[PDB]
Structures are given as C-alpha cells and as structure tokens.
Structure 1
Amino acid sequence: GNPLVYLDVDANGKPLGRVVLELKADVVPKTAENFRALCTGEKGFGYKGSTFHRVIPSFMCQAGDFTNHNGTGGKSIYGSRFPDENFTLKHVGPGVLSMANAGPNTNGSQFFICTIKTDWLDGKHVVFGHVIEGMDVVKKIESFGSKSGRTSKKIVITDCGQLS
C-alpha cells in the first residue's frame, strides 16, 4: 500500500506533536519515494533536524530545505532536482502535501502542507499526499508563521520516519 510516514515537530525545542502523512505512491511513485526516503534518512541525508522555514497563515507551511534552511536549497534522492511527475492530484483543501519548486521541473526536497485550499497551484506544483493525523499539529505550526512567512519560533522536524 501507500507509505504512511511521520514528522515529529518542535517549536524552540518544545514538542508540538506528530504529523502523519499518506504518500500517493499509486499516483506519483517517484515523488512519493523521494519523500519517503528523505523521512527515513536511508540514503544518508533527509529531513531529520531541518526546519519549517516559511509558514504563512491561511495558506501553507513550507519545509524540507535541509541544506540552506531558507527556501533556496534541498536536494532529492535522485540528484539535485527531478521532473514534475504528473499533476493528477489537486490542491483540494487543508492537509494536502505538495512539492515546492522554482518553476517547471525543479522538485528537490522542499515541500508544503496546505492550510487552505490552494487550487491556484493546480498544474504547477506536484501534489503527492495528505495529512492522515495531526492537522491540529499543522495548525500549531501555522500559529508561529506570519504573512511574510517568517516564523516567530524555530520550527524543527526533530524526528521522522515510516510507519507502514
């Protein structure tokens, strides 16, 4: 079945809880596999210890720049960037998990979790999963953002991995 993965998130070193995500390997196998492997750290790099660097209330929580920590870096398990796999899944509401990018065919490691329906990103960002449990944790993260995206606390993925 589709992988179930988790992120354990803290804010200035205080635990906020766990976000559980389903990855749609049945629809975007290569995108799902990248995220899955970055959660386990099995390639020797990934999300553990990195931050949510850009968090905009009523929009989304963005993370996965584990090289530069500011939205300019990250890398995939395939190399620095990989193509847009397809745009089959849509940004249908809060809890959608989608790939950040800098234009067509620039997927790396950065990703976002939507806190509203972000339909204007349909056909532009590759959707690959959704929140199974811990939308209340996502809302806590959202609470530390701002309209600019700057966070008021350091929001850290303290642990991550695969459940099934």
Structure 2
Amino acid sequence: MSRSKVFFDITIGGKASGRIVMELYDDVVPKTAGNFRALCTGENGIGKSGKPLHFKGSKFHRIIPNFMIQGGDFTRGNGTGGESIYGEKFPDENFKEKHTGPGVLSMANAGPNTNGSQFFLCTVKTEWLDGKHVVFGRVVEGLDVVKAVESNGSQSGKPVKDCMIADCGQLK
C-alpha cells in the first residue's frame, strides 16, 4: 500500500501562486490520511452540511506568521466549520508522527477527538503540538507556495487577502 499524493493549486488575491504537493502517511494513519485524500478529490459528494466535501474553492482562513497556515473550513470559511467524510468529528487516530519542521501537515481540532476537515501546514517546527494534533503528511513540493501564503497572515491570524485552494486532487 503506497502513500497518497495530493495537491492544491493556490491563488492569492486571485493570482495563480503555484502548486503545493503533499504526501500522506496512509501507512501510519490510514483513517486520517483517507479523510484528507477524499476531501482533495471531492469523491464523497455533498456532506451533512449540504456543502461539498471538497477543499476546492475553500480558503486558508487562519494564517499566523512564523507558525502555520490553516484551512479546510469549507462550510463556514471561518474556523467554526468543516466536516469529515465520516461525519462531523472523528477520534485522534494516533500521535506517532511529530511536528518536526516546516511542511508538516496536521489536523486542526477543538480538543481531543474532534477531527473534522480543518488542517494546518506548519512553517516551523511546532513541537508543543505533539500529542495534541494528529500529524498525517508532509509537503514534498511547493514549500515556497506555503511561504507566499504565510506572508499574507497576521499575528492575529486574519489573512490580508484571500488565499484560496483554486484546485485540488490526487496525483498518480
């Protein structure tokens, strides 16, 4: 069983900013990887929310310099929403992988066992999140695109302009 590869094509203020390619750890956290993979392809259609279970057209709603970029709220666009393919929330699968540096892909949450569709891409090592957020992949191409998004964040977390997942999907 091979690791999944998925991508985001990003726009910033409407402008094409390049592609982020991510490898998922299907071998370590199959359920969590599987959720994200299906959210990139959109293959499970319309969610309980009545909105597509799909990152396409969603934004990075929370961006903090020297920390991480966060998105996946395709129901409310503000961090209050999101939906996993399994339903509103699913448990923390395991904490085997750690937040070891820039490019780590990990699940956002509201406390233990509240995984939905929100995720973050780290721009630094964030070891204080180890054991609290489930790490399920890594950037393998486009870290510069992550940095471009990061430059539009604020300490407050509010973006200075819309950083959108203009397209997404699974590769190979």
What per-residue deviation string (whole Å, max 9, x for no partner) do you get for residues 74-98 of structure 1?
0000000000000000000000000
Equivalent residues in 2 for 1:136-147, closer than 5 Å: 136-147=144-155
Q: Whole-Å Cα distance in 1 between the matches of residues 160 and 124 of structure 2?
A: 21
Partner of 2:23: 22
Amino acid at match of 1:30: K
**Matching of residue 85 in structure 1 with residue 93 in structure 2:** yes
Amino acid at match of 1:127: V
1:46 is aligned, of 54, 69, 76, to 54
Give the drift of 1:46. 1.1
Q: Whole-Å Cα distance in 1 between the matches of residues 28 and 113 of structure 2?
A: 18
The CA RMSD over aligned residues, in Å, is: 0.5
Q: Whole-Å Cα distance in 2 between the matches of residues 121 and 63 of structure 1?
A: 17
Q: Whole-Å Cα distance in 2 between the matches of residues 146 and 79 of structure 1?
A: 31
What per-residue deviation string (whole Å, max 9, x for no partner) do you get for residues 13-70 of structure 1?
1011100000000000000000000000001121000000000010000000000100
Amino acid at match of 1:59: F
**Matching of residue 161 in structure 1 with residue 165 in structure 2:** no
Q: Whole-Å Cα distance in 1 between the matches of residues 116 and 54 of structure 2?
A: 11
Count of residues in Structure 1 that have an aligned counterpart in Structure 2: 164
Gaps of 5+ in 1: none
Amino acid at match of 2:5: L
Gaps of 5+ in 2: 46-52
Query: Equivalent residue of 2:61, what SS?
Result: strand
Partner of 2:75: 67
Give the drift of 1:12. 1.5
Partner of 2:34: 33
Q: Whole-Å Cα distance in 1 between the matches of residues 110 and 9 of structure 2?
A: 27
Amino acid at match of 1:17: G
Q: Whole-Å Cα distance in 2 between the matches of residues 56 and 17 of structure 1?
A: 20
Report the TM-score when normalising by structure 2: 0.94
Query: Percent identity at matched positions?
Result: 68
Q: Whole-Å Cα distance in 1 between the matches of residues 59 and 90 of structure 2?
A: 22
Runs of 4+ in structure 1 over 3 Å off = none
Partner of 2:49: none
Give the drift of 1:100. 0.1
Answer with 108-117 or 7-16: which moved more: 7-16
1:114 is aligned, of 122, 135, 139, to 122
What per-residue deviation string (whole Å, max 9, x for no partner) do you get for residues 109-155 of structure 1?
00000000000000000000000000000000000001111111111
Report the TM-score when normalising by structure 1: 0.99
